[PDB]
């Protein structure tokens, strides 16, 4: 199945979807009539092939001269998030689901673009320094201007946790120069190991009913959860608890036996981790209605994640903020103020109980589940929409 969760990052109206299309052919759709013209809310999904010519996009070597057929390397799946500074929660969720990143910078649009920088920062925070950098709108720029842009980018990427991350000049519309990108996908991104015995944990980003308009109820379908595994091969025929729960104010975890564990385009026996998977469960498709299973944790039955509202956070912050042009000073965190705490996939609205030296105690208005220590990206409301302040770990 899908071997490595590779994410796509860039500015809004630059062409992440376009890039995906160029790579795979699989469309992110762009939907709900708002997003048909403009920008997606959900993650965009695509399945790209790597079968190398060693003597590729398709498993045949008729194209690159030598008739010695395309030698199977990998199959990779995309994690394409919204690159808008309003919808950052989704991006954050994607980030602690990904194994590696793909940057997208346009030629004619500037080098210190705010959103892109923010994305980069997020990636750095959430252990995602494996970034393949792509020059995108180069089918517009001069023989000198492009070079200048590249130089500027290089200059920028000197103090960042990205040091010598590779840059490729592609056209997402004209279909050129993606060979290099493909090569890098095997070269610069090795897949981090993901075993059998590391306790099975599924991180849900999407809720899906496949209940088509027109059918009869004597021919029914269950609930499908679109979520990623980063530990534990889920096999067909297992019982599950989804632990952030269902709301009564108290919450109670949801129990579902596996109908299917579906990856690629064809349903499989297994779901080997480091991939984003559509899990058919006996759970109602009415709870998989639109975007209900977003930021929920799934464990195999006989397991104890903990649903915390009162949290011990170890926090770290910036000197100067991101999301804006206008990079504003980080004023100190203020008590009993609504922050957004992004933990793996959750985007919970939290109130500050205490501020110490490097630790903070937080109240959650919506309960999140901590199994391990859990990776956090933090966010705040200063300029209406949510800006990225810093990062944390749950000290548990």
């Amino acid at each position: 199945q899908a071997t490595i969760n590779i994410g796509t990052i860039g500015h809004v109206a630059h062409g992440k979807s376009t890039v995906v299309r160029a790579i795979s052919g699989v469309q992110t759709v762009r939907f709900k009539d708002e997003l048909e013209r403009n920008i997606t809310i959900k993650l965009g999904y695509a399945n790209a092939k790597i079968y190398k010519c060693q003597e590729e996009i398709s498993p045949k070597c008729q194209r690159p001269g030598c008739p010695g057929r395309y030698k199977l390397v990998r199959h990779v799946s995309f994690v394409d998030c919204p690159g808008h500074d309003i919808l950052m929660s989704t991006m954050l969720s994607g980030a602690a689901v990904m194994d590696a990143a793909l940057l997208l910078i346009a030629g004619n649009e500037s080098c210190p673009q705010p959103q892109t920088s923010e994305h980069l920062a997020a990636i750095e925070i959430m252990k995602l320094k494996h970034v393949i950098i792509l020059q995108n709108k180069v089918d517009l720029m001069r023989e000198e201007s492009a070079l200048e842009h590249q130089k500027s980018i290089l200059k920028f990427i000197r103090g960042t946790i990205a040091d010598g991350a590779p840059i490729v000049p592609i056209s997402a519309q004209l279909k050129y120069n993606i060979d290099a990108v493909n090569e890098f996908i095997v070269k610069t991104i090795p897949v981090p190991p993901r075993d059998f015995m590391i306790s099975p944990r599924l991180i849900v980003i999407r809720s899906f009913d496949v209940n088509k308009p027109g059918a009869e109820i004597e021919d029914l379908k269950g609930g499908v959860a679109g979520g990623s595994i980063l530990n534990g091969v889920f096999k067909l025929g297992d019982e599950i608890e989804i632990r952030p729960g269902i709301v009564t104010i108290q919450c109670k975890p949801i129990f579902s036996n596996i109908v299917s564990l579906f990856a690629e385009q064809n349903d499989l026996k297994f779901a080997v981790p480091g991939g984003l998977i559509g899990v058919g469960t006996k759970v109602d498709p009415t709870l998989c209605r639109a975007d209900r299973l977003v930021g929920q944790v799934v464990g195999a039955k006989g397991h104890l994640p903990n649903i915390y509202t009162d949290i011990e956070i170890n926090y770290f912050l910036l000197r100067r903020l991101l999301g804006v042009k206008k990079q504003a000073k980080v004023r100190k965190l203020e008590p009993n103020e609504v922050l957004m705490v992004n933990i793996g996939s959750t985007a919970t609205g939290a109130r500050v109980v205490a501020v110490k030296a490097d630790m903070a105690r937080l109240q959650l208005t919506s309960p999140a589940c901590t199994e391990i220590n859990e990776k956090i990206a933090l966010s705040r409301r200063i300029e209406k929409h949510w800006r990225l302040i810093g990062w944390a770990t749950i000290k548990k």
């Binding site: 590779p166 000049p169 056209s171 004209l174």
Partner: peptide, 17 residues
């Protein structure tokens, strides 16, 4: 490195419509 990139860029420039 931005010089195994330079070659790529050159190639791209060569094969534009």
């Amino acid at each position: 490195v931005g010089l195994p990139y330079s070659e790529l860029l050159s190639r791209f420039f060569n094969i534009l419509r």
